[PDB]
Design a protein around this ligand. Structure first.
Ligand SMILES: [Mg+2]
Lengths: 452, 454
């Protein structure tokens, strides 16, 4: 049941790419080719950007009620596509079937519902004295989205842009294009106006680069790796840029913790989505006194992690997304071993019986010095680095020495200690004890003397 | 007398620069050098950034009433320095004395007042369910400020950073460092804690580049030219610093056919000549209806004659000189480019006015029969040069008004209210002005702690 996706969605219809080349989409679990998309070029981008540019004033000044109605149609049709979306995510990403529906599918639906509902009370116009302040769509927006959560960032940005009235040109990851294609089918069926949504498949060089360079794109929203994030080509055109960051996130374990619970929680942060999450708990800070006991429970917990085929019942962890990505995970593991980090559990290679498909082994390094490569750099795989600490201020100092500011975690009993740690960690998000966007597309204009 | 400003203000004291070299500051009106500042280097920057880095955690967590009282001390001392500030601005910028007092000085004062007052009630902490959401100072922030309003962007950013609890490293324009030096004196006198404010004078290569590239600077705030802006924002792409760029533009002024001709000429002339046309929001493109064209130009010729260009310290001078020789030449190059392209010279022209050959003085200049595709239509001149573009139907006017690379400002002057509203709403700009009618968040970032109260 091969999928031929090679057409691009531009100006209200599916059209053949200007490029004669295609990109094979691979199932990370079986290594087999499940379909293909266009390997897109500048010509595709230019055609799509022009189509967006032609409609941007029309979309901007579309009434809020009208845009909300469109979002409702999208909500309905998205639900109609539920099984198609779950199957696609499982196939292309390698996510277990249960997580495909309850996490990946649900995320997308939530973003669209939230955007539609926000338009009930959102104020695009405010009177101050004799002056009127308005908020309007920024206009044509480029979107480059990650593979790790193909429905997440994609649905979020599209829902926001549609709510705002900004038309878009989307390049999904060539690694996981299928969910984006379905969204395009959805948009086409509910009839989002011609030019408002455009889908151009391809890679960074063929598509990503020209899109970020296009003079008629007023806004650029990117999600992905650090180097590609470097924003340099959008500084020439002075595009508004939304950064998305990788991270090495510390998980600090207090010495008063229930050890089994800490082991469960930290394992979960590392193992989830095969460890490819930007917020993952890959650096675990443990007290010396409870170190041996914690490691013992940790080893136990890892052995019970279920790594295998996503379509098979019970699978917790699927494969790594791609050969290239799988290789990077292996190299980082090998590098930690070269550094003299003691390998506690797992390590390089594939699990027995899993030799087909890219399957990383959940891996624990212990006695890690924070200056080590596996400590400093983002692996994007199920690799945990355990770092011991004697006192709390030391743990904080370690947790805070990183290039990344993305996320942090702490688990323990004593409240003030938990609060001291949480407040001390410098990150946008800190989570204690496993506790369970439209502005971006808008511009503010003040009209002076409107009323007088 | 000659000001020796060659000392940097770093780590709570006036210190000798690590550099052995200096930069001369010139009076735009007299062409003489009125003083010197350090030509700063990477070493000065690193010392300043480290001094800020050492204190940033403490300043972030200092209390609201503490920062507010600091700003209040600043407000008071800023008022004490009023004459010094006015003289300095006039000397270094070339702004007329009355404008330096009424506009430049006042702007800075208002900024510190607004920031102080805003802290009266501002919510840095909000509980949501069992989660805590806090707004905290982003930490060490670099500031690079322009010469066209030396006390404006400087005071605005400094007040915001102080209100937020972010320490700063400031590099002022080496064209207009004096106002910034005075601010430093004020901050030192009222006892802004050491490391919180740092002044490093120099140019783009010695100071601006190392500052923008510094791994310990978490935020960069820049106001100035486009070319430099792209340059600095590109250097901030490696560290993924938060960047705020504020840039110039070509702002259309749309005149309706029902307007009063004299007041139209009065309004449009004012928007062009103010601050010798160096304003980012300047009204440099003037769109006039084809029917009132001849009558408008005649009154426009009359209004420009009433514009007094000359010595800033001379009583009644409306318009001073251009800031610098380099910038004066740029204005000249644009005026010539207009002639070269076939734009019709109406009033003014290239060269200095008769009677000032000394100082950099551009003649207020009107071009008519201008096509919007011309260079003088499409590019910011930063001088008192007006391009008059006629239109037939209002749809054409909006089209021309919105064909520019800039989104900065727009103006419409007329009578019919529905027409004014439509034009105002149609112009793409951040600020639109109908009939000549009359922050801290930048330095804060949000941190959510999940299950804080759980
Ligand atoms: Mg000067």
């Amino acid at each position: 049941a091969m999928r031929d996706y090679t057409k691009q969605y531009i100006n209200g219809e599916w059209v053949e790419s200007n490029s004669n080349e295609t990109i094979e989409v691979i199932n990370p679990a079986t290594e087999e080719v499940i379909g293909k998309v266009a390997k897109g070029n500048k010509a595709d981008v230019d055609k799509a950007v022009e189509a967006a540019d032609d409609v941007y004033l029309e979309f901007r000044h579309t009434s809020v009620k009208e845009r909300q109605a469109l979002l409702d149609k999208i909500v309905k049709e998205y639900e109609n596509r539920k099984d198609d979306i779950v199957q696609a995510i499982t196939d292309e990403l390698g996510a277990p079937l249960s997580l495909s529906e309850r996490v990946h599918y649900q995320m997308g639906l939530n973003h669209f519902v939230a955007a539609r509902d926000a338009l009930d009370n959102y104020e695009f116009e405010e009177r101050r004295g004799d002056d009127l302040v308005v908020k309007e769509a920024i206009g044509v927006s480029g979107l480059i989205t990650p593979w790790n959560f193909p429905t997440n960032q994609t649905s979020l940005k599209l829902a926001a842009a549609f709510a705002a009235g900004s038309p878009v040109v989307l390049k999904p990851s060539e690694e996981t294009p299928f969910a984006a294609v379905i969204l395009a089918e959805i948009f086409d069926k509910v009839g989002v106006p011609k030019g408002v949504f455009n889908l151009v498949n391809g890679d960074g060089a063929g598509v990503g680069n020209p899109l970020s360079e296009h003079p008629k794109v007023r806004m650029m929203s990117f999600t992905g790796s650090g180097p590609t994030g470097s924003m340099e080509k959008a500084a020439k055109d002075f595009k508004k840029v939304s950064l998305e960051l990788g991270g090495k996130s510390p998980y600090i374990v207090l010495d008063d913790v229930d050890i089994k619970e800490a082991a469960k929680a930290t394992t979960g942060k590392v193992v989830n989505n095969t460890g490819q999450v930007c917020t993952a708990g890959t650096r675990v800070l443990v007290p010396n006194k409870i170190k041996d006991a914690f490691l013992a429970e940790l080893k136990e917990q890892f052995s019970q992690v279920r790594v295998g085929n996503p379509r098979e019942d019970g699978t917790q962890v699927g494969p790594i997304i791609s050969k290239k990505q799988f290789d990077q995970v292996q190299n980082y593991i090998n590098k930690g071993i070269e550094e003299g980090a003691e390998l506690f559990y797992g390590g390089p290679g594939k699990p027995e019986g899993l030799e087909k498909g890219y399957f990383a082994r959940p891996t624990i390094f212990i006695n890690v010095d924070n200056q080590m490569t596996i400590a400093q750099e983002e692996i994007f795989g199920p690799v945990m680095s355990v770092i011991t600490y004697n006192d709390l201020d030391e743990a904080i100092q370690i947790a805070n020495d990183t290039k990344y500011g993305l996320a942090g975690y702490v688990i323990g009993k004593d409240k003030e200690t938990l609060h001291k740690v949480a407040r001390s960690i410098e990150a946008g998000t800190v989570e204690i004890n496993e506790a369970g966007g439209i502005e971006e597309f808008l511009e503010v204009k003040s009209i002076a003397g409107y009323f007088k």
